[model samples]
Target: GEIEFIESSKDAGFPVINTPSKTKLEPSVFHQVFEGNKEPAVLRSGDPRLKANFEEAIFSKYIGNVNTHVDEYMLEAVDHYAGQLATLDISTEPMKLEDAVYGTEGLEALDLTTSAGYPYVALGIKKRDILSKKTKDLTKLKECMDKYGLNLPMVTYVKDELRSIEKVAKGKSRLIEASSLNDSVAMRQTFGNLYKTFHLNPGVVTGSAVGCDPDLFWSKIPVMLDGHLIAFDYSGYDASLSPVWFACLKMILEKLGYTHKETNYIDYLCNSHHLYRDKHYFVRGGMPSGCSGTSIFNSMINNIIIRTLMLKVYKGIDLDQFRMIAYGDDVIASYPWPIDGSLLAEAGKGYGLIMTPADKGECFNEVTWTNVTFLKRYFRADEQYPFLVHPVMPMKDIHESIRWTKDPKNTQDHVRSLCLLAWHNGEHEYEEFIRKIRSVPVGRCLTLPAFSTLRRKWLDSF
Candidate 1:
């Protein structure tokens, strides 16, 4: 009986916690109907021409017959999101890159490849010209230096980091050589995946963007304004701003006379048959994803400028409404309900940004409600023991336990380190996570061993 239960659980994916009734929303459906998930209608449409029926065709044509079990919970979730966009009282406008730029000189026309064919598009600002423009602005230069204290010392450190990254990028020939073991098609794919994984992270952009901090720009900072919580996130933020928007930010950073060489080189795909050059747009704003330096700096500039304007434009705006935790393009502000999103939207246009409604959980009415979707924990409005000695102890312990139990290489020393930390933090709540973890069979759980081994390791850790 015990063996059968373990086998069944193992067969079904190793989920420490089963998907609850409320959490069973289909990702594709949610993106399709969600208010902020706007894309070109053709991209979002389920037309037969767009390969929507390709799978169905393959099934009926080749397989002849099919029997599928419809999960009623999944169907209900899809139906729930259907037409939900029509019910919400939300208004927002998309931003155009051309309208967001400071000046249009040196704007370049580039070609972006599509599935059908390559389209020659007129977009992008020249890199060298923008760098020159910023270097010449002496007034904004002084202000940026005054605020950020960005000086030669900081530039030297950044430059050294960049140089170190460049070396690392070039030193990965062994990996490239190893990938060529397969056929040409497999070799090309493997090489591409390897480059993206290895080379992208060591860049100045990534080091500056994510750096060593896991919580850098990932968390929102909330404050109370007019007894309401307000935060804003940009739509298609990174690929949405013009070169001029970045030029304004660069003018300030260039005060230190430092700049990184930005470019878009050719990437060969599928045995040199399909090749495309990446866009050298100004808004590559975050690590590994986009230009990290500009992403962080542009966001900072936007945050400062927008907050300053809000206080000026909206009379009686309190400075206390501001919080110190906005990164990239997402901002959280506290403002009146039925939030004058119109005001922020208008202000954002001047900076080459569009204000889009964030998650409903971010709205004033839902601020107090616990949203387990993204955040596993949140600060409750009222908590006597708010500053618990170790808030993340349970989470940390469980993760360590999982890692120790799964990986054969993990030693007793590793488990002991985790246990010592948990005990030192006065946290002994490892049992609950362990119980759930054990409920799932060994095969189902990622690399987990038998109950005896797991229990022995758990006990040994303490």
Candidate 2:
């Protein structure tokens, strides 16, 4: 049966294409010891860690009874998440307004239950003082989700076409740590369920600094609720960053065996996420920027999407079939086996992540391959992933890049792109990159292999 959506609500607008029913996404149920159907190496790898019963590391409690069937466990999980986070009647449960006030300075806290009766107020509160507006539409969207059985992580609303705010980042963009003001109220209720969350946080919090790319300073996302502006977004990321996170964390907790008590804190956060575009105000069906935990939550969930895809989807769970390298989000994997590129995008679609040949060009979800854009390019029309072991760099791409290098902005980047390509490909790729340049100076070409020496010198000078 088709889940026909209405023109009025955005969550229902782009109904998920893959799943057919009120399908809730959950984690895989893998036993600690596999004495059946699995390879011996599973337990061989499982040994000491299995004996430790490190489930405690996952949660202090709320582990479901030893081994329930997967579907039954998931039913309990969705029920738990929905009941605890539901806002069918907010008056009876009331929000914990105290925890809602932290990301502020001299701005008055949340609106009280008063008249003028500013009941449902919306605020972006980015790099801010306080700017708030009341919206009947926000209430309308939430009610629409409930009545229509729509969920978050559904397509974010697009009024006329795709929408994006130009978010310029700055080191200073770190805080007013904005979100829809109503979500701070919702985040307070998240504490009890937050403890039930068992996924790992990102490494940046636990480790050393990395990467020195140029950062965007600040930008504005002009949003209005029924023509009244909400947040003055200064921090740079998109509306989807907020919603994408909900689906990612939703999967991580379900998989970590919180399988019996999982998702939709998104119910609060994403429902409150709003965007004003092209003469309309609609709820953001994605994630927001300028908030903690936004950067790494996707990596944690993406960490496992392929885990089960590789191990459980096939027969023996052979370790040799999959090899992956992941950063926080964009993953590059190499496995010489029969995995169609369609399955990668299909599995990822449930989480709103898209990866395919289209990703290399039109789609924003770029991928795990040597694309036509790379030094050693690869693309597979057969729907299977490609293995990039080519020795020759395509001349057409090289010439295209030569033209790209002449652009003033590109001249700054050309020196390093060659170094990284050579580090991975062969020494000749670097030599070709340099010798192909018409001149070694700035206008014709930025200085070359000479700059490999300059990598250290330029840093010392700065």
Candidate 3:
């Protein structure tokens, strides 16, 4: 039975619109993307304090300036912020939402932004207006996410699928941590510092500048780097896709034998990786940042790509000739003993990466030890190997700490930071050490004898 239309729908000579069917892939494929999500999809609604606490955590740990703050009004801002976020059909899990992640605490991160006479418009107590903006921000987010192949995960817990990649990273990639690459003894040396005591002085540089010295990188010194995955370039188009980075991702995955289905799934997640900010949902374009285990994954990808490129481009390039370590997009790489740093930049271009150094190679060699820095810590290297790694506190922080010693408030925080650092640097006497440190008497002011003693120890260690 031949079923033929009587009329040609007004286009017999010219071609008619086909009205194609099924441009989308199987929905089941998307299910496989976030396969083992622990928590289910939900709109959060517990306490406003949850978000407040979360805000504080991000501020205190990642971006706070250690300043005095506000409440009551900020709480109102948080409560309403959480309230509006709940109304959206966001595909994220319940606990991962604003309240818990951004609510639990406030004032710490928001504290500085509101009162410090910052360029930002959101002022003290008037944060509600800024918080409200996220409603529209996320509205655009969900729209773009679904429009492109980009998608979101309900929960980001337990990335079991990536466990293999993580192990491979640990097995293959070398890291520059407490253990010294050249002298194991120096790596474990007396294990102390003024900066070492108050060590974590991280300064996240922008896309333009990052660090590395090829000599130190190759010479077995403890080295690390900072990278801007969000390169402020090329995204003149939809930043969500992160055109160059995303392209390399697909190209590399295909080379690694990732099936079309697998690659597409990852592409969706990367392009759609979103975060909500002071009332605005920010689509962190380029590599999927703010996602769970994002740094590890980014680090792994950087290692593999750079290694593969080196092997392909250079001849007789034995692994021992150079070393490369990357955390997220930040990289510290050492190549052949002689030659141009421009090659490093050129090599990065192959992967659409901006390979600028935080500290250029020539500068590191010329600059004095105290002046040298890596991974945001003050790196003191020797003519042969590394000497000591210290903290990079600003003059303000040092002055603050001095004032802290004079009239310290919340002395426990300072103590805990040291305790944690000691535990990390292979402190065998940790059990004894932790016990003793906690006993440091906290008077109205931190001018106790025991406190003063520890201060001298920190001072002399430098």
lDDT of 3 by residue, 49-70 (tens): 2223332222121111112132
How good is model 3 by TM-score?
A: 0.35
Q: Candidate 2: TM-score?
A: 0.34
Candidate 2 residue spans exceeding 4 A from truth: 1-248, 251-277, 280-295, 308-324, 328-427, 440-446, 451-462
Query: Each prediction's Cα RMSD?
Result: 22.9, 21.6, 24.2
The deviation in Å at residue 157 for candidate 1 is 29
Q: After TM-score superposition, what is the CA distance of residue 198 in candidate 3 from its true location, in Å? A: 26
Q: Is candidate 2 or candidate 3 better by TM-score?
A: 3
Better of 1 and 3 by TM-score: 3
Q: Model 2 — which ten-residue stretch has the worst lDDT?
A: 216-225
Q: How does model 1 score by TM-score?
A: 0.35
Please state the error at residue 295 of candidate 3 in Å: 0.8
Task: For model 1, state the Cα shift of residue 315 in Å.
Answer: 5.8
User: In model 3, which runs have C-alpha deviations exceeding 4 angstroms?
Assistant: 1-150, 153-265, 273-285, 308-316, 346-351, 360-372, 381-411, 414-444, 447-462
- TM-score, one value per model: 0.35, 0.34, 0.35
